[PDB]
mmCIF file of C-alpha atoms and ligand atoms in Angstrom:
data_model
loop_
_atom_site.group_PDB
_atom_site.id
_atom_site.type_symbol
_atom_site.label_atom_id
_atom_site.label_comp_id
_atom_site.label_asym_id
_atom_site.label_seq_id
_atom_site.Cartn_x
_atom_site.Cartn_y
_atom_site.Cartn_z
ATOM 1 C CA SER A 7 -0.031 0.272 0.434
ATOM 2 C CA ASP A 8 1.144 3.161 -0.031
ATOM 3 C CA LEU A 9 0.864 2.773 3.806
ATOM 4 C CA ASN A 10 3.801 1.128 3.633
ATOM 5 C CA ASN A 11 5.680 2.945 1.664
ATOM 6 C CA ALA A 12 5.134 6.235 3.735
ATOM 7 C CA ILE A 13 5.817 3.618 7.475
ATOM 8 C CA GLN A 14 9.834 3.000 5.571
ATOM 9 C CA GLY A 15 10.458 6.483 4.631
ATOM 10 C CA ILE A 16 9.331 7.509 8.359
ATOM 11 C CA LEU A 17 11.658 4.391 9.496
ATOM 12 C CA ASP A 18 14.412 6.137 6.765
ATOM 13 C CA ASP A 19 14.536 9.587 7.149
ATOM 14 C CA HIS A 20 14.130 8.699 11.111
ATOM 15 C CA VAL A 21 18.172 6.774 10.840
ATOM 16 C CA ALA A 22 19.426 9.423 8.214
ATOM 17 C CA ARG A 23 19.080 11.932 10.909
ATOM 18 C CA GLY A 24 21.887 9.730 12.767
ATOM 19 C CA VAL A 25 19.639 6.707 13.913
ATOM 20 C CA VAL A 26 21.611 3.448 14.434
ATOM 21 C CA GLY A 27 18.617 1.057 13.704
ATOM 22 C CA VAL A 28 14.793 1.481 13.742
ATOM 23 C CA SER A 29 11.987 -1.898 14.577
ATOM 24 C CA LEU A 30 8.689 -1.697 13.896
ATOM 25 C CA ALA A 31 5.140 -3.388 14.620
ATOM 26 C CA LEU A 32 1.793 -2.108 13.979
ATOM 27 C CA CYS A 33 -1.562 -3.734 14.185
ATOM 28 C CA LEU A 34 -4.280 -1.638 12.035
ATOM 29 C CA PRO A 35 -7.827 -2.599 13.141
ATOM 30 C CA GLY A 36 -8.662 -5.462 11.267
ATOM 31 C CA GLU A 37 -5.530 -6.059 9.970
ATOM 32 C CA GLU A 38 -2.618 -8.609 10.912
ATOM 33 C CA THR A 39 0.283 -6.749 12.115
ATOM 34 C CA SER A 40 3.274 -5.470 10.346
ATOM 35 C CA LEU A 41 6.641 -5.228 10.765
ATOM 36 C CA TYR A 42 9.750 -2.529 9.260
ATOM 37 C CA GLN A 43 12.884 -1.532 10.350
ATOM 38 C CA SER A 44 14.795 0.775 9.151
ATOM 39 C CA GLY A 45 19.300 0.836 10.143
ATOM 40 C CA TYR A 46 21.391 -1.609 11.339
ATOM 41 C CA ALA A 47 21.261 -4.136 14.616
ATOM 42 C CA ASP A 48 24.485 -4.016 14.987
ATOM 43 C CA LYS A 49 26.836 -0.910 13.776
ATOM 44 C CA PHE A 50 30.270 -2.084 13.667
ATOM 45 C CA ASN A 51 28.951 -5.876 11.018
ATOM 46 C CA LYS A 52 26.601 -3.288 9.728
ATOM 47 C CA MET A 53 24.494 -5.802 10.152
ATOM 48 C CA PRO A 54 20.157 -5.168 9.241
ATOM 49 C CA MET A 55 17.861 -4.461 11.239
ATOM 50 C CA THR A 56 15.382 -7.420 11.688
ATOM 51 C CA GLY A 57 12.070 -7.373 13.254
ATOM 52 C CA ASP A 58 13.664 -10.956 15.427
ATOM 53 C CA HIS A 59 16.846 -8.618 17.163
ATOM 54 C CA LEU A 60 15.805 -8.416 20.269
ATOM 55 C CA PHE A 61 15.372 -4.745 23.145
ATOM 56 C CA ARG A 62 15.915 -3.636 26.137
ATOM 57 C CA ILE A 63 12.044 -2.637 26.660
ATOM 58 C CA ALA A 64 13.186 -0.544 30.412
ATOM 59 C CA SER A 65 9.922 0.669 31.476
ATOM 60 C CA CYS A 66 7.197 -0.875 28.212
ATOM 61 C CA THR A 67 8.161 -3.934 31.617
ATOM 62 C CA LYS A 68 5.891 -1.171 33.656
ATOM 63 C CA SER A 69 2.511 -2.213 31.849
ATOM 64 C CA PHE A 70 3.137 -6.046 32.360
ATOM 65 C CA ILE A 71 4.031 -5.844 35.949
ATOM 66 C CA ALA A 72 1.145 -3.929 37.047
ATOM 67 C CA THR A 73 -0.769 -6.426 34.269
ATOM 68 C CA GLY A 74 0.531 -8.849 36.506
ATOM 69 C CA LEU A 75 -0.381 -6.679 39.607
ATOM 70 C CA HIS A 76 -4.828 -6.630 38.792
ATOM 71 C CA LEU A 77 -4.155 -10.067 37.966
ATOM 72 C CA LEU A 78 -4.222 -10.479 41.302
ATOM 73 C CA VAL A 79 -6.730 -8.574 41.893
ATOM 74 C CA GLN A 80 -8.860 -10.775 40.290
ATOM 75 C CA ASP A 81 -7.853 -13.460 41.711
ATOM 76 C CA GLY A 82 -9.276 -12.440 44.362
ATOM 77 C CA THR A 83 -5.602 -11.818 46.946
ATOM 78 C CA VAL A 84 -5.154 -8.349 46.826
ATOM 79 C CA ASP A 85 -6.914 -4.905 47.020
ATOM 80 C CA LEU A 86 -6.006 -2.404 44.762
ATOM 81 C CA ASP A 87 -7.405 0.259 47.399
ATOM 82 C CA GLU A 88 -5.485 -1.521 50.678
ATOM 83 C CA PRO A 89 -2.166 -0.604 52.271
ATOM 84 C CA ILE A 90 0.748 -2.070 51.535
ATOM 85 C CA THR A 91 2.231 -2.544 55.667
ATOM 86 C CA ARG A 92 0.965 -5.600 54.801
ATOM 87 C CA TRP A 93 3.643 -6.429 52.787
ATOM 88 C CA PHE A 94 5.939 -3.656 53.574
ATOM 89 C CA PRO A 95 5.932 -3.235 57.421
ATOM 90 C CA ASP A 96 8.838 -0.743 58.229
ATOM 91 C CA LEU A 97 9.204 1.021 55.246
ATOM 92 C CA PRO A 98 8.665 4.351 55.837
ATOM 93 C CA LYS A 99 4.647 6.285 55.009
ATOM 94 C CA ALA A 100 3.854 2.713 54.385
ATOM 95 C CA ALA A 101 0.312 3.098 56.490
ATOM 96 C CA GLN A 102 0.006 5.977 53.776
ATOM 97 C CA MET A 103 -0.117 4.063 50.902
ATOM 98 C CA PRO A 104 -2.393 2.166 48.922
ATOM 99 C CA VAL A 105 -1.757 -0.164 46.495
ATOM 100 C CA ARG A 106 -2.595 1.664 43.994
ATOM 101 C CA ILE A 107 0.167 4.212 44.261
ATOM 102 C CA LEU A 108 2.692 2.488 43.767
ATOM 103 C CA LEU A 109 1.861 1.758 39.984
ATOM 104 C CA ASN A 110 0.397 5.333 39.781
ATOM 105 C CA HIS A 111 3.499 7.950 40.110
ATOM 106 C CA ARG A 112 2.243 9.493 43.438
ATOM 107 C CA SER A 113 3.340 7.814 46.430
ATOM 108 C CA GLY A 114 6.441 10.537 46.857
ATOM 109 C CA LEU A 115 8.351 7.532 47.118
ATOM 110 C CA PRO A 116 12.428 8.374 47.293
ATOM 111 C CA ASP A 117 14.004 6.712 43.644
ATOM 112 C CA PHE A 118 17.291 4.227 42.513
ATOM 113 C CA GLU A 119 17.730 5.278 39.003
ATOM 114 C CA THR A 120 19.844 8.097 39.179
ATOM 115 C CA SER A 121 22.101 7.372 41.753
ATOM 116 C CA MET A 122 22.652 3.950 40.204
ATOM 117 C CA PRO A 123 26.023 3.227 38.654
ATOM 118 C CA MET A 124 24.970 2.807 35.260
ATOM 119 C CA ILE A 125 28.427 0.370 34.207
ATOM 120 C CA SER A 126 28.694 -2.516 37.099
ATOM 121 C CA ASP A 127 28.120 -6.103 36.769
ATOM 122 C CA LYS A 128 26.032 -5.899 40.145
ATOM 123 C CA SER A 129 23.720 -8.972 40.440
ATOM 124 C CA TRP A 130 20.727 -6.848 42.177
ATOM 125 C CA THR A 131 18.478 -8.033 44.769
ATOM 126 C CA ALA A 132 14.695 -5.806 44.715
ATOM 127 C CA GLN A 133 15.835 -5.638 48.609
ATOM 128 C CA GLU A 134 18.470 -3.334 48.143
ATOM 129 C CA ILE A 135 17.302 -1.862 45.710
ATOM 130 C CA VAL A 136 14.665 -0.319 48.259
ATOM 131 C CA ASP A 137 17.153 0.596 50.660
ATOM 132 C CA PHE A 138 19.722 1.903 47.934
ATOM 133 C CA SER A 139 16.705 3.771 46.957
ATOM 134 C CA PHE A 140 16.157 5.041 50.687
ATOM 135 C CA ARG A 141 19.258 5.704 51.117
ATOM 136 C CA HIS A 142 20.536 7.797 47.653
ATOM 137 C CA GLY A 143 16.633 9.678 46.735
ATOM 138 C CA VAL A 144 14.322 12.288 48.367
ATOM 139 C CA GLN A 145 11.190 10.977 50.332
ATOM 140 C CA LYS A 146 8.059 12.623 49.767
ATOM 141 C CA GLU A 147 4.497 12.250 50.980
ATOM 142 C CA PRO A 148 2.845 10.188 49.630
ATOM 143 C CA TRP A 149 -0.301 11.536 46.578
ATOM 144 C CA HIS A 150 1.773 14.769 46.787
ATOM 145 C CA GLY A 151 1.376 14.722 43.296
ATOM 146 C CA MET A 152 2.997 13.188 39.931
ATOM 147 C CA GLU A 153 6.823 12.076 39.833
ATOM 148 C CA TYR A 154 7.709 8.909 38.583
ATOM 149 C CA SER A 155 8.410 6.361 39.988
ATOM 150 C CA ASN A 156 10.524 3.109 39.698
ATOM 151 C CA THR A 157 10.521 2.567 43.542
ATOM 152 C CA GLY A 158 6.227 1.882 43.717
ATOM 153 C CA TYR A 159 7.181 -0.370 40.850
ATOM 154 C CA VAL A 160 9.626 -2.761 41.766
ATOM 155 C CA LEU A 161 7.791 -2.443 45.748
ATOM 156 C CA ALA A 162 4.626 -4.258 43.117
ATOM 157 C CA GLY A 163 7.639 -6.816 42.059
ATOM 158 C CA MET A 164 7.784 -7.560 45.210
ATOM 159 C CA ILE A 165 3.958 -8.156 46.090
ATOM 160 C CA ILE A 166 3.441 -10.303 42.878
ATOM 161 C CA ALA A 167 5.794 -12.638 44.406
ATOM 162 C CA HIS A 168 4.853 -12.659 48.132
ATOM 163 C CA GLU A 169 0.844 -13.309 46.413
ATOM 164 C CA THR A 170 2.314 -16.196 43.829
ATOM 165 C CA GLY A 171 5.108 -17.579 46.610
ATOM 166 C CA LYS A 172 7.925 -17.254 43.507
ATOM 167 C CA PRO A 173 9.354 -14.998 41.494
ATOM 168 C CA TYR A 174 6.833 -12.400 39.608
ATOM 169 C CA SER A 175 8.623 -14.438 35.433
ATOM 170 C CA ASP A 176 6.857 -16.969 36.933
ATOM 171 C CA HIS A 177 2.851 -14.851 37.610
ATOM 172 C CA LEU A 178 3.510 -12.579 33.696
ATOM 173 C CA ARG A 179 5.099 -15.792 32.059
ATOM 174 C CA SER A 180 2.162 -18.587 32.928
ATOM 175 C CA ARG A 181 -0.672 -15.303 33.234
ATOM 176 C CA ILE A 182 -0.014 -12.917 29.795
ATOM 177 C CA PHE A 183 3.429 -15.139 27.917
ATOM 178 C CA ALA A 184 2.984 -18.408 27.310
ATOM 179 C CA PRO A 185 -1.316 -17.618 26.338
ATOM 180 C CA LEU A 186 -0.853 -14.730 24.116
ATOM 181 C CA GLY A 187 2.253 -17.094 22.351
ATOM 182 C CA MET A 188 5.127 -14.481 23.214
ATOM 183 C CA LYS A 189 7.848 -16.483 22.605
ATOM 184 C CA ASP A 190 10.526 -13.854 21.411
ATOM 185 C CA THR A 191 10.189 -11.807 25.733
ATOM 186 C CA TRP A 192 12.155 -12.732 28.412
ATOM 187 C CA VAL A 193 12.202 -10.862 32.251
ATOM 188 C CA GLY A 194 16.188 -9.856 32.780
ATOM 189 C CA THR A 195 15.949 -10.835 36.613
ATOM 190 C CA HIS A 196 15.225 -13.632 37.064
ATOM 191 C CA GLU A 197 15.174 -15.327 33.264
ATOM 192 C CA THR A 198 18.655 -15.572 31.251
ATOM 193 C CA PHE A 199 17.744 -14.802 27.692
ATOM 194 C CA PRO A 200 19.429 -14.779 24.581
ATOM 195 C CA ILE A 201 22.496 -12.045 24.264
ATOM 196 C CA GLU A 202 23.454 -12.939 20.625
ATOM 197 C CA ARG A 203 19.826 -12.366 19.668
ATOM 198 C CA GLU A 204 19.869 -8.271 20.181
ATOM 199 C CA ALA A 205 20.213 -5.493 18.935
ATOM 200 C CA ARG A 206 23.134 -3.710 20.576
ATOM 201 C CA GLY A 207 22.303 -0.630 22.267
ATOM 202 C CA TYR A 208 24.114 2.386 20.977
ATOM 203 C CA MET A 209 24.954 5.663 23.157
ATOM 204 C CA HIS A 210 25.857 8.762 21.419
ATOM 205 C CA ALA A 211 28.635 11.249 21.708
ATOM 206 C CA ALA A 212 25.794 14.256 21.023
ATOM 207 C CA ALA A 213 25.945 17.230 22.011
ATOM 208 C CA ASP A 214 22.429 17.731 23.597
ATOM 209 C CA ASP A 215 23.722 15.260 25.227
ATOM 210 C CA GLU A 216 23.744 18.005 28.497
ATOM 211 C CA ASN A 217 22.552 17.033 31.291
ATOM 212 C CA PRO A 218 22.287 13.293 31.402
ATOM 213 C CA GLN A 219 20.465 11.198 33.745
ATOM 214 C CA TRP A 220 22.576 8.586 34.304
ATOM 215 C CA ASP A 221 25.864 7.466 36.095
ATOM 216 C CA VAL A 222 27.608 6.094 33.298
ATOM 217 C CA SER A 223 30.837 6.754 34.252
ATOM 218 C CA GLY A 224 33.694 3.817 33.265
ATOM 219 C CA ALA A 225 32.112 3.868 29.276
ATOM 220 C CA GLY A 226 35.680 4.787 27.895
ATOM 221 C CA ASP A 227 36.163 5.795 25.181
ATOM 222 C CA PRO A 228 33.686 6.320 22.347
ATOM 223 C CA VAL A 229 34.404 4.637 18.651
ATOM 224 C CA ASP A 230 32.978 6.288 15.475
ATOM 225 C CA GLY A 231 30.876 8.995 17.577
ATOM 226 C CA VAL A 232 28.943 6.082 19.971
ATOM 227 C CA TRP A 233 29.499 3.807 22.512
ATOM 228 C CA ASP A 234 28.348 0.616 22.483
ATOM 229 C CA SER A 235 26.073 0.346 25.539
ATOM 230 C CA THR A 236 24.249 -3.320 25.512
ATOM 231 C CA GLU A 237 25.649 -4.548 28.206
ATOM 232 C CA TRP A 238 26.395 -2.113 29.921
ATOM 233 C CA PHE A 239 23.563 -2.348 32.958
ATOM 234 C CA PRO A 240 21.687 -5.960 34.330
ATOM 235 C CA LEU A 241 18.096 -5.827 34.150
ATOM 236 C CA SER A 242 18.578 -7.466 38.390
ATOM 237 C CA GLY A 243 19.252 -3.070 38.269
ATOM 238 C CA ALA A 244 16.107 -2.214 37.543
ATOM 239 C CA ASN A 245 14.337 -5.019 37.799
ATOM 240 C CA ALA A 246 10.240 -4.889 38.235
ATOM 241 C CA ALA A 247 10.979 -1.560 37.287
ATOM 242 C CA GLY A 248 12.453 -2.447 33.342
ATOM 243 C CA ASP A 249 13.888 -5.721 32.389
ATOM 244 C CA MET A 250 12.401 -7.330 30.268
ATOM 245 C CA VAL A 251 13.326 -8.421 26.373
ATOM 246 C CA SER A 252 10.828 -8.453 23.795
ATOM 247 C CA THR A 253 10.323 -7.707 20.160
ATOM 248 C CA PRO A 254 7.967 -4.908 19.128
ATOM 249 C CA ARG A 255 6.433 -8.332 17.532
ATOM 250 C CA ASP A 256 5.646 -10.155 20.173
ATOM 251 C CA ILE A 257 4.609 -6.726 21.863
ATOM 252 C CA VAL A 258 2.384 -5.650 19.927
ATOM 253 C CA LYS A 259 0.561 -8.813 20.227
ATOM 254 C CA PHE A 260 0.307 -8.351 24.135
ATOM 255 C CA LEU A 261 -1.303 -4.430 23.449
ATOM 256 C CA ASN A 262 -3.635 -6.686 21.445
ATOM 257 C CA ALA A 263 -4.676 -9.013 23.591
ATOM 258 C CA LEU A 264 -5.235 -5.977 26.522
ATOM 259 C CA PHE A 265 -7.384 -3.988 24.630
ATOM 260 C CA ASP A 266 -9.217 -6.712 23.486
ATOM 261 C CA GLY A 267 -10.405 -7.991 27.332
ATOM 262 C CA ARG A 268 -8.067 -10.898 27.066
ATOM 263 C CA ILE A 269 -5.831 -10.427 29.214
ATOM 264 C CA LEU A 270 -7.526 -8.220 32.851
ATOM 265 C CA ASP A 271 -11.555 -7.752 33.188
ATOM 266 C CA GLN A 272 -13.588 -4.525 31.623
ATOM 267 C CA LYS A 273 -12.255 -2.881 36.105
ATOM 268 C CA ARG A 274 -9.140 -3.652 36.109
ATOM 269 C CA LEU A 275 -8.452 -2.846 31.723
ATOM 270 C CA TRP A 276 -10.469 0.821 33.097
ATOM 271 C CA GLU A 277 -8.409 0.705 36.307
ATOM 272 C CA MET A 278 -4.884 0.478 34.050
ATOM 273 C CA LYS A 279 -5.733 2.762 31.429
ATOM 274 C CA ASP A 280 -8.920 5.393 31.848
ATOM 275 C CA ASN A 281 -8.120 6.014 36.102
ATOM 276 C CA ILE A 282 -6.185 8.369 35.251
ATOM 277 C CA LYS A 283 -4.262 11.311 35.915
ATOM 278 C CA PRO A 284 -1.697 14.234 34.831
ATOM 279 C CA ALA A 285 1.548 12.961 34.523
ATOM 280 C CA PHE A 286 4.463 14.004 33.198
ATOM 281 C CA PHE A 287 8.392 12.820 31.753
ATOM 282 C CA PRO A 288 11.436 14.874 31.103
ATOM 283 C CA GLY A 289 11.005 14.743 26.625
ATOM 284 C CA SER A 290 8.488 12.862 26.299
ATOM 285 C CA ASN A 291 4.791 13.543 25.350
ATOM 286 C CA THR A 292 3.248 12.272 28.250
ATOM 287 C CA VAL A 293 0.695 14.069 29.834
ATOM 288 C CA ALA A 294 -1.378 11.817 31.794
ATOM 289 C CA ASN A 295 -1.168 8.782 33.692
ATOM 290 C CA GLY A 296 -3.867 5.258 34.670
ATOM 291 C CA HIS A 297 -2.050 2.847 36.743
ATOM 292 C CA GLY A 298 -0.203 0.316 34.427
ATOM 293 C CA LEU A 299 -0.166 2.917 31.454
ATOM 294 C CA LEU A 300 0.960 6.746 30.230
ATOM 295 C CA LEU A 301 -0.762 8.543 27.880
ATOM 296 C CA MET A 302 1.417 10.313 25.952
ATOM 297 C CA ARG A 303 -0.099 12.301 22.803
ATOM 298 C CA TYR A 304 0.901 12.802 19.784
ATOM 299 C CA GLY A 305 -0.810 15.945 17.989
ATOM 300 C CA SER A 306 -4.460 14.918 17.294
ATOM 301 C CA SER A 307 -3.434 10.817 18.726
ATOM 302 C CA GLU A 308 -2.944 9.771 21.732
ATOM 303 C CA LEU A 309 -1.303 6.678 22.569
ATOM 304 C CA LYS A 310 -2.328 4.444 25.482
ATOM 305 C CA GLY A 311 1.076 2.630 26.455
ATOM 306 C CA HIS A 312 4.659 3.381 28.020
ATOM 307 C CA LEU A 313 8.152 4.475 27.062
ATOM 308 C CA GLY A 314 11.038 2.845 27.970
ATOM 309 C CA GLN A 315 14.783 4.531 27.846
ATOM 310 C CA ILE A 316 17.456 2.362 29.147
ATOM 311 C CA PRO A 317 20.801 3.073 27.534
ATOM 312 C CA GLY A 318 21.178 2.523 23.609
ATOM 313 C CA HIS A 319 17.526 1.116 23.162
ATOM 314 C CA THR A 320 14.354 4.262 23.600
ATOM 315 C CA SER A 321 10.552 2.579 23.153
ATOM 316 C CA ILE A 322 7.192 3.535 22.937
ATOM 317 C CA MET A 323 4.867 1.417 23.041
ATOM 318 C CA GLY A 324 0.540 2.305 23.080
ATOM 319 C CA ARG A 325 -2.607 2.063 21.188
ATOM 320 C CA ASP A 326 -4.258 4.638 19.592
ATOM 321 C CA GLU A 327 -8.072 3.892 21.053
ATOM 322 C CA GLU A 328 -9.518 6.425 19.104
ATOM 323 C CA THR A 329 -8.188 4.634 15.232
ATOM 324 C CA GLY A 330 -7.819 1.359 16.828
ATOM 325 C CA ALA A 331 -4.122 0.627 16.305
ATOM 326 C CA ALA A 332 -1.179 -0.613 18.559
ATOM 327 C CA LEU A 333 2.031 -0.119 17.969
ATOM 328 C CA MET A 334 5.787 -0.325 19.332
ATOM 329 C CA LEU A 335 8.716 0.960 17.692
ATOM 330 C CA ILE A 336 12.414 0.928 19.503
ATOM 331 C CA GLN A 337 15.252 2.109 18.201
ATOM 332 C CA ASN A 338 18.022 0.858 18.989
ATOM 333 C CA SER A 339 20.425 5.007 20.001
ATOM 334 C CA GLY A 340 19.782 6.202 22.813
ATOM 335 C CA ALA A 341 21.268 9.275 25.604
ATOM 336 C CA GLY A 342 21.497 10.391 29.050
ATOM 337 C CA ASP A 343 19.924 14.230 28.820
ATOM 338 C CA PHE A 344 15.971 13.964 28.261
ATOM 339 C CA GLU A 345 15.822 16.706 26.246
ATOM 340 C CA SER A 346 18.555 14.641 23.365
ATOM 341 C CA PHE A 347 17.254 14.163 20.403
ATOM 342 C CA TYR A 348 18.737 10.511 20.379
ATOM 343 C CA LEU A 349 16.234 10.231 23.439
ATOM 344 C CA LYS A 350 12.509 12.353 23.180
ATOM 345 C CA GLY A 351 13.870 12.023 18.581
ATOM 346 C CA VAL A 352 12.206 8.617 18.897
ATOM 347 C CA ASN A 353 9.241 10.563 19.590
ATOM 348 C CA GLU A 354 9.296 11.778 15.864
ATOM 349 C CA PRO A 355 8.602 9.334 13.670
ATOM 350 C CA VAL A 356 5.650 7.799 16.113
ATOM 351 C CA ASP A 357 4.101 11.412 15.833
ATOM 352 C CA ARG A 358 4.643 11.100 11.842
ATOM 353 C CA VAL A 359 2.938 7.132 12.012
ATOM 354 C CA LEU A 360 0.184 8.035 13.766
ATOM 355 C CA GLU A 361 -0.604 10.370 11.109
ATOM 356 C CA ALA A 362 0.260 8.069 7.892
ATOM 357 C CA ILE A 363 -2.330 6.339 9.263
ATOM 358 C CA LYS A 364 -5.110 8.856 9.962
ATOM 359 C CA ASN A 365 -4.475 10.096 5.960
ATOM 360 C CA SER A 366 -4.895 6.466 5.115
ATOM 361 C CA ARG A 367 -8.335 6.985 6.190
ATOM 362 C CA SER A 368 -9.749 10.638 5.634
HETATM 363 N N1 LIG B 26 12.438 5.579 31.772
HETATM 364 C C1 LIG B 26 12.489 4.472 31.640
HETATM 365 O O1 LIG B 26 12.621 3.285 30.820
HETATM 366 C C2 LIG B 26 13.570 3.855 32.545
HETATM 367 N N2 LIG B 26 13.538 3.937 34.343
HETATM 368 C C3 LIG B 26 13.903 2.419 32.860
HETATM 369 C C4 LIG B 26 14.633 2.150 34.554
HETATM 370 C C5 LIG B 26 14.706 1.217 35.215
HETATM 371 C C6 LIG B 26 14.694 1.304 36.568
HETATM 372 C C7 LIG B 26 16.940 1.431 36.195
HETATM 373 C C8 LIG B 26 16.991 1.417 34.688
HETATM 374 C C9 LIG B 26 16.476 2.317 33.545
HETATM 375 BA BA1 LIG B 27 26.872 18.689 32.286
HETATM 376 BA BA1 LIG B 28 27.615 -5.409 32.516
HETATM 377 BA BA1 LIG B 29 -9.019 13.522 17.858
HETATM 378 BA BA1 LIG B 30 -5.944 11.275 2.414
#
């Protein structure tokens, strides 16, 4: 179609800007998932990006942890409004923290991401990360306002594990990956994934990388204007906040099933996607969030899904509720600064795609 051609052109233009590679999966109503790629999986080997290359999805993981949690709500063992003192009795302010605040970025919890060394081989524990957060972050009052929280999701993961008696990867695999045939999806803290299949991730030595969000010391020198950051950070360090590995294809599988109502009942899905308040994420198109899903605005279209930033892999997934379209776009270029083109600019091709879809429907 002319749509195919416009979309490939969008991805082509984006890599021509200096993005190493990009992988897209897009499903439209009444149609199969279409896959598109441009540029390279591996910059130095000049290996072409395919629909089978795996990426670290970063915070897109949170949508799966939220889903996992809401599933345990359905099982009747968890209440979205009950205090987390049940699982975390000695956690400061826990009595003011209902289960839901862990998912909605309004808990005031101290965060760990900006203090955590991104270059490391340390195997982290969920509790280590929690203790590390309280050591290095600033805690605010629950319900102070929205401030993006990775710690809330780590604690969510710990609930999943206590309520099921196994690592949270087991719950996500049996209740989500298996039933939907997501065969190319892994949970990084608790599962070994095949590195040889992963697209390489690239941090760019860019001029607009002024205020890096990460401790990226120990990097060494850039080759051809980039670092290969694929294996800088062990995924256990992100844990339930960003440890998943997947393909745009598998992500769209998840997204179709979620919005179709084939995972969560009507009430848990409404909670995830419709029970919303305003939300900010620096550099991004985020305007609101629910309990596991961000609302990201692209002119006259909006996606409900998530963004993900983990060194070298930059992702946007979501569902446009008006058009029915589900998408996951991951590039293997990034930087440290939220406002860098290599981070924030992942939104440009996304915006262009939603407007091309719109055109072909007008
Ligand atoms: N926006 C993101 O995708 C990152 N917060 C994911 C992440 C969590 C924890 C550590 C590193 C990375
Ligand atoms: Ba500086
Ligand atoms: Ba390492
Ligand atoms: Ba509109
Ligand atoms: Ba037209």
